[PDB]
Amino acid sequence: SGIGIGFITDNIILDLQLSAMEKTGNGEIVSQPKVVTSDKETAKILKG
Amino acid sequence: SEVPYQEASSSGATSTSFKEAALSLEVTPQITPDNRIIVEVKVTKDAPD
């Protein structure tokens, strides 16, 4: 990904590189399940 | 369709299990006068893995 190459070869081969990586990842997941339940009773939505 | 699991474990356990990944409605409706129902309903969708 990130390589900065300085090369001499003709006079001498002298290689000087600054190799840097910056990675950015953002993941956002927003899920909303709605369940209709009796009162004081259990009801269950399961999505899997 | 009925997704099984066949664990055939010689020394006494033959888990020839199966379970149907079927759409289904299992309903126990109670009918109240104004054309209404309080129903215990299992509404399941499942599917082979």
Curated annotation (Swiss-Prot), chain A:
Where it sits in the cell: the answer is: Cell outer membrane
Family membership, please give it.
Belongs to the bacterial secretin family. PilQ subfamily.
What role is this protein assigned? Essential for the formation of pili. Involved in the biogenesis of type 4 fimbriae probably by serving as a 'porthole' allowing passage of the fimbrae through the outer membrane.
Protein name as it appears in the record: Fimbrial assembly protein PilQ
The scientific name of the source species is: Pseudomonas aeruginosa (strain ATCC 15692 / DSM 22644 / CIP 104116 / JCM 14847 / LMG 12228 / 1C / PRS 101 / PAO1)
Q: Which gene encodes it?
A: pilQ
Which part of the full protein does this chain span, and how long is the full protein?
530 to 577 of 714
UniProtKB/Swiss-Prot annotation, chain B:
Where does the protein end up? Cell outer membrane
What protein family does this chain belong to?
Answer: Belongs to the bacterial secretin family. PilQ subfamily.
This molecule's function is given as: Essential for the formation of pili. Involved in the biogenesis of type 4 fimbriae probably by serving as a 'porthole' allowing passage of the fimbrae through the outer membrane.
Q: What name is this protein filed under?
A: Fimbrial assembly protein PilQ
Q: What species does this protein belong to?
A: Pseudomonas aeruginosa (strain ATCC 15692 / DSM 22644 / CIP 104116 / JCM 14847 / LMG 12228 / 1C / PRS 101 / PAO1)
